[PDB]
A paper describes a structure:
During ubiquitination, the 76-amino acid protein ubiquitin (Ub) is attached via its C terminus to, most commonly, Lys residues on substrate proteins. Ub has seven internal Lys residues and an N-terminal amino group, all of which can be ubiquitinated, leading to the formation of polyUb chains. For the remaining four chain types, linked via K6, K27, K29, and K33, very little is known, and proteins generating and recognizing these chains in eukaryotic cells are still elusive. We found that the human HECT E3 ligases UBE3C and AREL1 assemble K48/K29- and K11/K33-linked Ub chains, respectively, and can be used in combination with DUBs to generate K29- and K33-linked chains for biochemical and structural analyses.
We crystallized K33-linked di- and triUbs. Examination of adjacent asymmetric units only allowed one possibility for K33 chain formation, although the C termini and isopeptide linkages were poorly ordered and not built in the model. The Ub moieties in K33 chains were related by translational symmetry and, in contrast to the compact diUb structure, adopted an open conformation in which Ub moieties do not interact with each other except by two polar side chain contacts. The distinct conformations of di- and triUb could be due to differences in crystallization conditions but highlight the underlying problem that crystallization may present an incomplete picture of the dynamic states of free polyUb in solution. We therefore turned to nuclear magnetic resonance (NMR), which is better suited to analyze dynamic Ub chains. K29- and K33-linked chains are flexible and able to adopt multiple conformations, much like the remaining chain types (Ye et al., 2012).
Residue numbers in the entry: 1 to 73
Write the structure that this text describes.
């Protein structure tokens, strides 16, 4: 399924994911597409900071949902 990742720069990238995918794997996908190292990535959805070990389905992230990417040093 397609999801959107909104960056602070104002740019939004599209990811192809499955609800069974872990947050860690999503961050890996972001690295492959944009080159941002996972340890610098903070993902936000529905006011929650997403935890690496959990899956997208755990957070009820549906298709065409938008995640917010904030970078930590």
């Amino acid at each position: 399924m397609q999801i959107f990742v909104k960056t602070l720069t104002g740019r939004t990238i599209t990811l192809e994911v499955e609800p069974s995918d872990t947050i860690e794997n999503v961050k890996a996908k972001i690295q492959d597409k944009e080159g941002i190292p996972p340890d610098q990535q903070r993902l936000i959805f529905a006011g929650k900071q997403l935890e690496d070990g959990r899956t997208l389905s755990d957070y009820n992230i549906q298709k065409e949902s938008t995640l917010h990417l904030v970078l930590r040093l």
